[PDB]
Amino acid sequence: FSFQGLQISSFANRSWTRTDGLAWLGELQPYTWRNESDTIRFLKPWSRGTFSDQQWEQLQHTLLVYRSSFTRDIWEFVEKLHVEYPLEIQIATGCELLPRNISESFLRAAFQGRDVLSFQGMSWVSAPDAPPFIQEVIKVLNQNQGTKETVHWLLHDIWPELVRGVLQTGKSELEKQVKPEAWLSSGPSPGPGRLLLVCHVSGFYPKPVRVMWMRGEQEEPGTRQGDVMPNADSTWYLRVTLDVAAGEVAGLSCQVKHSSLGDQDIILYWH
Amino acid sequence: IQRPPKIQVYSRHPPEDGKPNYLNCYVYGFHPPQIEIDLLKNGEKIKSEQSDLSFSKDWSFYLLSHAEFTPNSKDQYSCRVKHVTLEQPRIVKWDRDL
Ligand SMILES: CCCCCCCCCCCCCCCC(=O)N[C@@H](CO[C@H]1O[C@H](CO)[C@H](O)[C@H](O)[C@H]1O)[C@H](O)[C@H](O)CCCCCCCCCCCCCC
Ligand SMILES: *[C@@H]1O[C@H](CO)[C@@H](O[C@@H]2O[C@H](CO)[C@@H](O)[C@H](O)[C@H]2NC(C)=O)[C@H](O)[C@H]1NC(C)=O
Ligand SMILES: *[C@@H]1O[C@H](CO)[C@@H](O)[C@H](O)[C@H]1NC(C)=O
């Protein structure tokens, strides 16, 4: 279960900007930070981790000063470099705990939907093939010792200590297993004398899963995987389809493999 | 720079007429993040909930909008999506079968 802190910043004109934050641990969202709010919100009882109220308050103050400063600082880069409007900036930052004691952290960012810069070891490094001016934004950002120090601390002290504690408090919820329902339906016609067999699987946690159309032990190819799509309760949904002649439909089944079931797959025959 | 929304609609549970359920409309792969997602019963907006906006590895956004509903014989459902890459609001029908 890796940790990802996520920032979405919209600068439309100069009177109107918003910055939103949220954070994922594994598949679950333990934090949100709405523009309207001066404080992060804990979405789960385990969200607070092992951090004390003081550590949380300090981390908050830093981030709140950051958000304010980020806002005005972008606007200055905008006016003093005549960049376009609107602007969408996103930032992703996080880490994961690897075996032994090694932990790798990161902070990359995006301008207009693609990579633009990141943070490597001790300094801001620009991303290959990026708009002309950001090499010059990188110039300024590298002359701000304080911000560079604060980022380093965050990535190397704060995220790892936060994730260790939240991995502990959230263990039972993170590692839980929810069994899927499954059901069959006849879908839109692929042609005269054809059927679209549709197997639906819904309500499994976690996300890795395997759903195939079968004839005995031989997997039917022609099986088209849907995307795995979220439900509101942090479970998932997937539909898997088969374009088959209405004649050859007998003996077909849909088999569902999921970590929650063991070696006891769900099996459904077409009736 | 600019990506259009992909839209999928599906119910939470097997869709049995009469039994309360959840209708899900999943909008993803888009950019800019500004978007509007309405769930419609027979053309009319219904009370729905939206998750926090988020994004994937490649910086494109996604959003889950869900609402309670009770499917039956007559009523038809759909999802309406307005985005800057769509000159007319895009509409996607709920197909119980797919
Ligand atoms: C818990 C879930 C919430 C999710 C939150 C998402 C995580 C986002 C990452 C957090 C970044 C943390 C960095 C904090 C460093 C910081 O405070 N930077 C601030 C604050 O500095 C201010 O206070 C300091 C000390 O108190 C100094 O005195 C400064 O002079 C003063 O200006 C800094 O000034 C400035 O805002 C840095 C901006 C970073 C921008 C890098 C992002 C790349 C965007 C590139 C966009 C391209 C340009 C478009 C025009
Ligand atoms: C900054 O941007 C917002 C739109 O992103 C503008 O707000 C709109 O302004 C019109 C006309 O005044 C209002 O009727 C709308 O209700 C607003 N829409 C939204 C989505 O906010 C705002 O006018 C812009 N301001 C400047 C100074 O350019
Ligand atoms: C969001 O927050 C900022 C800073 O607190 C505020 O000044 C601004 O008006 C807000 N933006 C929007 C779009 O509501």
Residue numbers in the entry:
A (entry chain A): 8 to 278
B (entry chain B): 1 to 98
Report text from the authors:
CD1 is a family of antigen-presenting molecules that is structurally related to major histocompatibility class I (MHC I) molecules, but binds and presents lipids, glycolipids and lipopeptides, rather than peptides. The overall structure of boCD1d is very similar to that of other CD1 or MHC I molecules, in which the boCD1d heavy chain is organized in 3 domains, α1 and α2 that form the central binding groove and α3, which non-covalently associates with boβ2M. The glycolipids are bound in the hydrophobic binding groove that can further be divided into the two main pockets, A and F. While the A pocket binds the acyl chain of each glycolipid, the F pocket binds the sphingosine, leaving the structurally distinct carbohydrate headgroups exposed above the boCD1d binding groove for immune recognition by cognate T cells. Secondly, the conserved disulfide bond in human and mouse CD1d that anchors the α2-helix to the β-sheet platform (Cys166-Cys102) is absent in boCD1d.
